[PDB]
């Protein structure tokens, strides 16, 4: 995460400092993938609109990443995971793509836990991009409740002294003068 943010900032700086005004396709691919990782859909959409169609035509992988981003915008998790694992991502895109895949898992895992007091096993399986059965053991080991008769899943929703002294001294200093 921290390295991904540092990589994003470096890629962002390179785009600004582009000599010919266009960045290398690896930089654009890294920038688009990193925006999808942070769920920054607006920046990903605006960067895609910024990219000239010549790079899109000359690099079909760039269009594939955008298609995944469109799936992320529509939030169709079964479609998102299918599109993520369908296109072969290069050595600069495969690791970050898997991080996006992991990020989608954690997001959907939290979305179900927060919003869904009860959820169908098939619906939860579709949301997490895993088949039903081992998803059940994955959440039972997570301390959740599952009903086998109705196939329903019941998720379980989950300053130092020096700083305080400095803040209070700031209070007194501000209010004294």
């Amino acid at each position: 995460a921290f390295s991904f943010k540092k990589l994003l900032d470096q890629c962002e700086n390179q785009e600004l400092e582009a000599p010919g005004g266009i960045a290398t396709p690896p930089v654009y691919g890294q920038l688009l993938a990193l925006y999808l990782l942070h769920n920054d859909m607006n920046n990903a959409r605006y960067l895609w609109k910024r990219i000239p169609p010549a790079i899109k035509s000359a690099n079909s992988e760039l269009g594939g990443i955008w298609s995944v981003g469109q799936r992320i915008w529509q939030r169709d998790f079964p479609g998102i995971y299918t599109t993520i694992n369908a296109h072969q991502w290069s050595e600069t895109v495969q690791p970050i793509m898997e991080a996006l895949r992991d990020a989608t898992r954690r997001r959907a895992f939290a979305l179900v836990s927060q919003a869904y007091t009860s959820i169908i096993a098939d619906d939860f399986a579709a949301f997490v991009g895993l088949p039903v059965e081992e998803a059940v053991k994955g959440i039972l080991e997570q301390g959740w409740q599952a009903d086998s008769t109705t196939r329903m899943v019941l998720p379980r929703k989950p300053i130092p002294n020096e700083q305080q002294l400095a803040r209070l001294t700031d209070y007194v200093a501000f209010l004294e003068n």
Binding site: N161, E162, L165, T169, V172, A173, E176, N177
Partner: protein
């Protein structure tokens, strides 16, 4: 009158000893009032019982000095059989050890550590200990908790002297750290006052300079 009775047995232990002393110690464990057994253990005749053939009473007295009720349950073969008063006194001592660490004691812990089956007798033992000025506190029955405000202390095997020294050193270090922080606050407040005075004198100098200009 427990202390006076304790001192009299101390004076008697300086002389007569043996089976009479062991029976005397058993009477101490049966006579209500005595809640501190450290003074008895330090008598030289208790050390005479150490090399003496009889050791069941000494191991009994040693457990009352340092052990608790669960340890006594483990040693029901090596210790002389207690009486109802001796068992209650040890149970009170065990409650003292429990109350020393945690100021709030759930009823589940009380029923477990003391072999307590009926909760009614648990209340009777708790009130009996309090009314004999052993523990001061409050009982929460809705949450099944025992909130103890104050309790008597217990004995030391001279190996906790190092722990006491460490705790006192930690307290001293914390007090010194708080004192240094307070002094740093003194310095910061004085610096802020000096900055305010500098701003005021700068404003006054600017006003006087403009007055001289006109």
């Amino acid at each position: 009158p427990s202390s006076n009775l304790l001192e009299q047995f101390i004076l008697l232990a300086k002389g007569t000893s043996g089976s009479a002393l062991t029976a005397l110690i058993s009477q101490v464990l049966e006579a209500p009032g005595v809640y501190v057994f450290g003074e008895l253990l330090e008598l030289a005749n208790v050390q005479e019982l150490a090399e003496g053939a009889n050791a069941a009473y000494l191991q009994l007295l040693n457990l009352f000095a340092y052990g608790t009720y669960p340890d006594y349950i483990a040693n029901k073969e090596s210790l002389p059989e207690l009486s109802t008063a001796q068992q209650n006194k040890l149970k009170h001592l065990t409650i003292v050890s429990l109350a020393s660490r945690m100021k709030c004691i759930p009823y589940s812990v009380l029923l477990k550590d003391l072999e307590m089956r009926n909760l009614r007798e648990l209340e009777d033992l708790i009130i009996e200990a309090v009314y004999t000025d052993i523990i001061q506190g409050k009982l929460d029955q809705r949450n099944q908790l025992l909130e103890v405000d104050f309790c008597i202390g217990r004995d030391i095997r001279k190996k906790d002297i190092n722990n006491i020294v460490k705790t006192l050193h930690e307290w001293c270090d914390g007090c010194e750290a708080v004192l240094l922080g307070i002094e740093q606050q003194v310095l910061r407040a004085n610096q802020y006052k000096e900055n305010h005075n500098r701003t005021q004198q700068q404003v006054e100098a600017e006003v006087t300079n403009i007055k001289k200009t006109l």
